[PDB]
């Protein structure tokens, strides 16, 4: 079995952004949920962007960003335990935003 694409959203505070996301069912305690997170600018493409991983988390603070610009972001998860991994889920639907000027 494979998990459903997680749900993405972007929130702001002053000018510090952050990516938030949730899954369908809460993870079992004896199983970790590995998340692959990536975000870029309309200009570049996914392929050419770094995807930093995280485990059992539902959010990620974002580095400072270029004022006045339009970004993007997607996430996907897999069920892992003791090194055995699950089927990487379909990417979350791409959520985008436009940095404040």
């Amino acid at each position, epitope marked *: 079995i494979q998990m459903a694409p997680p749900s993405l959203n972007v929130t702001k505070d002053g000018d510090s952004y952050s990516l938030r996301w949730e899954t369908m*069912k*809460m*993870r*079992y*305690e*004896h*199983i970790d949920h590995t998340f692959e997170i990536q975000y870029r600018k309309d200009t570049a493409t996914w392929k050419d962007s770094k995807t930093e991983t995280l485990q059992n988390a539902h959010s990620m603070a974002l580095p400072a960003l270029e004022p006045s610009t339009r970004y993007w972001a997607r996430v996907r998860v897999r069920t892992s*335990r*003791t090194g*055995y991994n699950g089927i990487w889920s379909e990417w979350s639907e791409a959520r985008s935003w436009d940095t404040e000027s």
Partner: antibody
Amino acid sequence: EVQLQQSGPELVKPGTSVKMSCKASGYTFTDYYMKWVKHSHGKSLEWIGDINPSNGGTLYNQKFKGKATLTVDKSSSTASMQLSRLTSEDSAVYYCSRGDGIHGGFAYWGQGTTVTVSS
Amino acid sequence: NIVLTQSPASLAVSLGQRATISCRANESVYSYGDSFMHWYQQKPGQPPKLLIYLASNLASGVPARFSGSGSRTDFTLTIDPVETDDAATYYCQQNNEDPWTFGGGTKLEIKR
């Protein structure tokens, strides 16, 4: 030593709802899930649901969905559970347990709470 | 919903003898390398206590008389030699695929 102090015995009238608790100690509260179990009289156990004290996450057994709601309060390291629409059949012993994650199960148990539904 | 089945429901074993209890699951409980089957001892008036975790591991504090083994669907909890302190009801609980579940229990009575 891990410690699970549960609330005391309850006598409740049908149709109403109780709200037992369970104070933890002996380890970081948010490091493990709190699991609840219904040990009906003279029988085997029944899982009710777990909760991730960290983000309040929650997962229920479906037979108990809508009956029991699991809550947590970090500042005071207490996990509380609420039972509504109480009836004669809800009369049973309820335990709170702490999880492990290295085996995912009920590693430490509280002494339990005896709820009696009757008029 | 993995349905555990404990056999036999009760048994009277003599002090110093041997006691084996079986627990068979509707479906497999193995995955991610381990078998998510744990055993429990519950003494009258006493909440359950963790006996064996992850099929063969003895919980911190359990006597060397207690041992557990089994894999996909069939598990056996063995107590040898049987003691008086052991007079209790025993449970197996699967944790492979929610809803988590326990067996019907097995109450053994020390013989003497």
